[PDB]
């Protein structure tokens, strides 16, 4: 009585569209994949001054969602035998051997449990040598492996070690190995000149258009729906990338109701809304939390990740056994809680 594509479009309209007016967001792409059918919904403008509409070609910044590709790359290297998650970074970055950071293993870096790594690098750490200096000068604080503190330097060092183990710059790991293995055609660490007319302007909180170990990916909604498809259907992919994706799905420890996988955050499904919101609370995101072993290995589960830059917001979520996922991209930050709420409302109302 109402075709499925229209039902999903109506749900996105009801839950995501009001965010455009509420947060003065110029442009937004929302994608749903269900049962290997993709639905793409585009709103607004990728560049306000150019009156250029958001569309299937629009490139957005993923912010911390980029960590999902770092995690996938590490799962790939690990299953190609290039690294062990029990290895320390000094095995690959030789100038870190005999240093304090060489007590931390690669899994602990990937899952934010070094015990003394903040959310971001200091603002002055830009030179690739300044990164080496920062880790050479690093000293432990909390006991290694016991406290999760969400940290871009932490998984950044992990990505650096991954790239060294594959004898390539990290951006070439993604652009020449990981992105092609996932069938992504419009995903970049460095957006080529020929694609700059598709690169959305990011917009700051005044609606003004605005380091190499800062690993940051740009992508389109079709590519992110394809990435979600890969996470929903790892058996459809070659052995190496299949094992890579499964590696990112394994929960490693818990903080309350949240399971920390590689890059992905993992939850028992069905997940209460507040479980998903707790994962982005200041307590979880900004403060150290003691981690606990997994007790309940979730049989039925879901995964999500928020991401932001100064001018962009991202949310990705998927539920394997419901064969469904959703991506939201915007060229203006909106509160993480609003992304989670809107996606939760859509995913729970889509007819099964």
Author numbering: 1 to 210, 219 to 360
Verbatim from the authors:
The class C Acinetobacter-derived cephalosporinases (ADCs) play a significant role in antibiotic resistance in A. baumannii. β-Lactamase-mediated resistance to β-lactams can be overcome using combination therapy involving a β-lactamase inhibitor coupled with a partner β-lactam antibiotic. X-ray crystal structures of ADC variants in this study provide a structural context for substrate profile differences and show that the inhibitor adopts a similar conformation in all ADC variants, despite small changes near their active sites.
Additionally, ADC-33 and -219 contain a Pro213Arg mutation and an alanine duplication a few residues prior to Tyr221. Perhaps most interesting is the structure of ADC-219 in this region. The Ala duplication (Ala218, Ala218a) of ADC-219 are the first residues observed after the completely disordered region (unmodeled residues 210–217) in this enzyme, and the alanines are out of register with those in ADC-33 and -212, with Ala218 of ADC-219 overlaying with Pro215 of ADC-33 and -212. This shift of Tyr221 results in the side chain of Asp222 occupying the space left vacant by the tyrosine residue. Whereas most of the sequence differences between the variants occur prior to Tyr221, ADC-219 is the only variant to contain a sequence difference after it. The higher B-factors in this region of ADC-219, as well as its weaker electron density as compared to the other structures, suggest a more flexible, mobile loop that potentially samples multiple conformations.
